[PDB]
Write a protein that binds this ligand. Structure first.
Ligand code: AKG
Ligand code: AKG
Lengths: 458, 458, 459, 458
């Protein structure tokens, strides 16, 4: 009699459902056995973590590493320190990580870990001691050839460092055992740029396919929402490829271009400085360059979608549910043909459904083409693979090298979606395949066939 | 945020209760910290087990090893294969194992493991393939100085053989990694006898103490339940000591003696053979000697306790929760003055409360005296420690040497419980000390103190 | 080379070497001169940084050391010392001696010594825990039940051994005999507290028997002891149990003497033990019974007991190193003392040792004072550590009587080996007592050097 | 108390003094804690080395490995066999190695080891046996992910081969555990070239910065001293980049170009053959091509500095203390703007002082710019990292690939010095940053911040 694990059960049921609404099990019914094998994790470690607080008292938390699947590579996935953490949640997140990592084409398996340790209110001294204790036990079960964790909620650069330092001390090895490391001790260039550059490259690959290699970002008008790092670097990449960035935004309003034109790199760097100083877009229109009313128009309380006029590409990069069903319709009437999520779950289900029905109802490049976040914002995962690659040679690559490689990985990510959809949700003649359906299946099918090849099931 | 683990949480709450109801936390209030720490397992491993059935189909089950505590020694405790198995249950069994193992005097930590694999209806080949697969993963986490498992429900000598065989092949070490091994490949004499002998030995000390050296098993009437190896060898040792054995039973009914007789060794040998053949007591009453209705009465559907009439000692040795509140009172009315669990968790908390209430109410030899399983049925795990001792010595001791050490262990276990109750749960004059409270405190403090010494808490 | 100056170690090497030269050993086996040169260089030395957090939350740095000197006879064995004086030279000195002390027990134990310059003085239990955790995080790599088995020494008692054991078992994930001096319920040995003290006395029993042709024992002898910790206590109680009289104890502040005939009783030693548990002085118990009975007890502040004991038959220095000067050696000689053995490690100064030895070689029969070296006479401690390792591998706890029995046999064999080896290689003049110093040094060295040769460490 | 370690204490004091004469401890006083922690080695192994001489006699020597710091990478640094070897000396060298290695921007820590073994007058056989015995112990402590030694005085190709053979045998792994290996068994192309080429690339980066990327080696006149591997390859690189090499020299004299012109690659090759035959430059001037007195002038007993006329770059690449105070002033007067040490400690302190005062007194490209050897001759170390990178993939890069990558590493070495001087020894407006000060501080700052991130100090 199995324990109640609602978050994991939900995630399994969603996969099994998306697999069922496809021809996968008509063509390959034996993959139902794969579904059953894959959803029992290969290994789970749980361990007590004892650590000393600043008053000198004994404290107790619970440590976790779910090593869910390793058919395609060593276990890969983040560590989460948050009071809500438990096996059920970490299984949900680790299970999903299998298939998102699989989607990229990198040799990365699937895992998730962490603790119910709550870093809110903790001194750095406390976080250090917790991390030291935590890694003392975890060290046994991980390694560059076995399991390579990373950060998540509660585990950023600071914690990764403390974790790395203690691993090194116990194991007496310097290796790529974590990703998200500092620039001087095995971190990668292009790490801040990864997500934003990643979305723009994915969309480039979409355009290329949709137009049979005749169009790129060159000459295209691109609406971006957000003004954090993802939006800034997506904007910079667009510009670098010859596109026009016509909008940026924050939670209070949108800053948009009047008529023809684009934001410039300099302007983007000014918006970055204002973002570092916690200031809102509303406050920078007072001075130049943004006080020029012939180039720039600030719109209070608005998202950009209905205000940019005619537009070719939309790149939501702010927050979740920032494209309504209604806004999807306007982008469609604005002639938008490509949309990809920079923000996690940026499109509402109504918007996704809209873009998909439009796709189904319109042959070729007359359709709007939506890419889901698990595919289009896999840049951060992509650069993690490159950080590992780089670590194996104790050698850093140039910005240009990491960038070029990030581009190729997003192509693999794209193609896995495209081809899976073509095979298992085959569209009508001249209709673009669904990247949402393709991306939801493709991880499972790559992992399942790998598992079969390796005798994990038969 | 934690998962609901009721079997485990109840055992914890109940131990905490017996510790509160004593002077232990008055004289050492710090030990409450130890309680919070010890209750979180050092390490838990869970893992997928894929195995092939006789049709050649893939089958999936879940593997577990709870390494609960190692302050006194390497993790020690059985493997259970039963479809009820899960983490909560093994946490429950593993927690109890800590304190049982502690009480043997031997350097043995507490652990428990197994699988939801059901051996019912499986071929021997299927069981072999399952054990090969199970041990392939488990081998990484165990070892002669790390974790030493053994049998339990679903895991007999047969399974231990398959498990050992696989370990030796992958680890390339021949060592005391398991106990309950076969005689020619590192098994110990007296291991089959140990639990049953051990409870009888323990109870002999109870009789001695409660009667001020007046009495022994000589002339006592002893009601036993069950008919597996515990009940058998308990029966045989009672007979050796001059007691009468007046009942045995299985899951279908009770075989009782009429009048003032007793089972014989020869009759016990016959019941043992009927049990190897997985037959029932109801199948053997229709032929001699058990068809003799002057001596024997078979009672279908019944536990033996009402049907034995007046008895002096009760040795439940069948199954968990086989003595209820009602039956505790039946045994009190029968003139029963000693009860000790041969089986794991034989008495309900209601029966325990009933017995303890009776002890408190009735000074001296009038009291029914109850010994907890962690003390009284420690004989088995004790002889496992001796199997480990023998493997490390690279010798096989005679039956007489193993048996001698088992007697010293059960003696010291009784003395410790008795003296610890005298110190921290001091009874009124003439009142028997609580073996429940004394055994719990003794076991707990030995672990907690060792944990403090080793810096696990402070 | 330009080797670093390591005076403590270099001095011990030369003294050892000299005692070997004053024998037939290198005449009979000149090739052992190469053995000696090879044995003098440690097999392995590990040094390491130990970073640890104080109670104020500040980072602190100390240096950690393990000298794995020799392993021909067994895994490296020897204690850990936390004391501000600790460095490589000092640990090499103590590790070198440990080789030969361990060899004389007859058990399979090699020779090692380690520790840190961490100063436990003034540190909280918590600080001590944090230091041990961090220290063992690095040391774990280099030690093990079949590799190197440390123990306590100055600055490392049961408390530290516990924190050190706990951290090892956590990182290594093996429960094993990696340390000795462990606690009773987690693989310690009975008799370990008594070992060193009982051991000296057992050894001296054989000295007395040999010197007097079995005509005397401890019965009726007056015994002066210095110190008031475990060694002094259990030595005293064993002497009392053998029918001798203990006429002094002492601590770093003064000595507490018996006046006239008479002895400390076990009850008095028990009280003294309780006060030394409380970290009090012998000073601050004299004004309270029974130690205020100024007919039986005299206290002298600032003094060692040797000049105040009157006539004495046996002396058992059991406080600290270098606690019998050459002058005090003469005082004991003139007091009529005939038997001396060290309860404290390096109790006698070299000057005292040269005096006892001069006096032995100048006097026939039992008119001579007989000095036993520490490597023979206080091996009781490390012997029972060896027994602890044996118990751990047996996965059993022996009884008091069994550990004690074996301790007795070990000390007896150790005495015999020193005696007979001196008779063979450093034969005394007719009627002179065999030198247990030369005897023990030769016996220890040759056991190691011959085993090294069998194992191809030299040829 | 502590042992007397004079060479190490000196090296420690010089670092502490450099760090005090900067703004580092004003801006970041907590880095004093870093200095105290970093100056205690992480680990030191000493060991007895017993080996057999050619007469069959036992010999005894002392082996050492100082594993000083691993924050930025596995321990890296050479092995020295010389009768002066001891812990103090090896700590001195390993301490310096941390910060030099750090300076390259490669993921390499800092270490040094060796023995007091004297190879003077030993047979190849004796050297083989010593190495076998030495590596038998050392193997335990090192490894491709832990510690990667190399050569030094007493340890060249021959010894590296013997050491690697024995490691392979015992460890049964083929990996990059040593650098300086033979071409066919893991050595890198560009290895003989590395130091010489490395010096020239470093100067290229200096030229680019000083001139706004307006100038290069193209059209420059370059005075080089020495005529061994470093001068030869430095020369060849200069010629490849369009520069003129106007001198070379040996201990007895200088061979310089008469008027404008340059040595050619064919001429460099001739000088290389003569140097292999162990002939001095004085004796190659009696034949063609060097007898042509219109092109070549031999100056007996002179260094080249005062005899080359106007020159843009100076590359002392012969020995130590080969540019006097006077010669530094002559070079300044000859229009020399770039000076960098091919040879270890080639510039006297008077010369370094003179170049630094000139820099201070002369805004921008008017200055002569001195690069210290720890930065400019770090190419040997750079190619070591590339050898490690190539060993990971069991794959040799092309000469062009190794060479291009060496150039980049020398840019990182440059940037680390430049930027560090900018921050902590900030020059007046328009004045070049001190590469000597920058290079002496930059390694420490990189290591200290990585140490802090990793919880080594806090
Ligand atoms: O011998 C063993 O280790 C298994 C015994 C056990 O699990 C028990 O005491 O219930
Ligand atoms: O118990 C041990 O291992 C030896 C302690 C020690 O170093 C000694 O004999 O002084």
């Amino acid at each position: 009699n199995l324990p109640h694990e609602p978050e994991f059960e939900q995630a399994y049921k969603e996969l099994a459902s998306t697999l069922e609404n496809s021809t996968l099990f008509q063509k390959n019914p034996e993959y139902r056995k794969a579904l059953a094998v894959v959803s029992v994790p290969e290994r789970v470690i749980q361990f007590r973590v004892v650590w000393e607080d600043d008053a000198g008292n004994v404290q107790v938390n619970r440590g976790f590493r779910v090593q869910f699947n390793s058919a395609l590579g060593p276990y890969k996935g983040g560590l989460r320190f948050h009071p809500s953490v438990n096996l059920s949640i970490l299984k949900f997140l680790g299970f999903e990580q299998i298939f998102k990592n699989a989607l990229t084409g990198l040799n990365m398996g699937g895992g998730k870990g962490g603790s119910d340790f709550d870093p809110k209110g903790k001194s750095d001294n406390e976080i250090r001691r917790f991390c030291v204790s935590f890694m003392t036990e975890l060290c046994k079960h991980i390694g560059a050839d076995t399991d390579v964790p990373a950060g998540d909620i509660g585990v950023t650069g600071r914690e990764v460092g403390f974790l790395f330092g203690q691993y090194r001390k116990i194991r007496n090895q310097w290796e790529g055992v974590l990703t998200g490391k500092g620039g001087s001790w095995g971190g990668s260039l292009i790490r801040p740029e990864a997500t934003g550059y990643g979305v723009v490259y994915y969309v480039e690959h979409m355009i290329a396919h949709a137009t049979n290699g005749q169009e790129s970002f060159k000459g295209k008008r691109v609406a971006i929402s957000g003004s954090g790092n993802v939006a800034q670097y997506a904007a910079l990449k667009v510009i670098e490829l010859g596109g026009s960035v016509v909008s940026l935004s924050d939670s209070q309003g949108s800053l948009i271009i009047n008529g023809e034109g684009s934001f410039t790199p300099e302007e983007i760097e000014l918006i970055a400085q204002t973002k570092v100083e916690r200031k809102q877009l509303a406050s920078i229109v007072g001075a130049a360059p943004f006080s020029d009313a012939n180039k720039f128009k600030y719109i209070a309380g608005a998202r950009p979608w209905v205000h940019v006029g005619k537009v070719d590409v939309a790149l939501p990069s702010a927050t979740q549910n920032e494209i309504s069903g209604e806004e999807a319709q306007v982008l469609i009437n604005a002639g938008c043909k490509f949309i990809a999520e920079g923000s996690n779950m940026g499109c509402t289900q109504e918007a996704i459904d809209t873009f998909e029905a439009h796709r189904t109802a319109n042959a070729g490049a007359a359709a709007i083409w939506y890419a889901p976040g698990k595919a289009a914002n896999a840049g951060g995962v992509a650069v993690s693979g490159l950080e590992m690659a780089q670590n194996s040679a104790r050698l850093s690559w140039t910005s240009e090298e990491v960038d070029a490689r990030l581009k190729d990985i997003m192509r693999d990510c794209f193609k896995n979606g495209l081809e899976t959809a073509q095979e298992y949700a085959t569209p009508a003649e001249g209709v673009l395949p669904s990247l949402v359906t393709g991306s939801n299946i493709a991880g499972f099918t790559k992992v399942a066939a790998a598992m079969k090849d390796q005798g994990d099931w038969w």
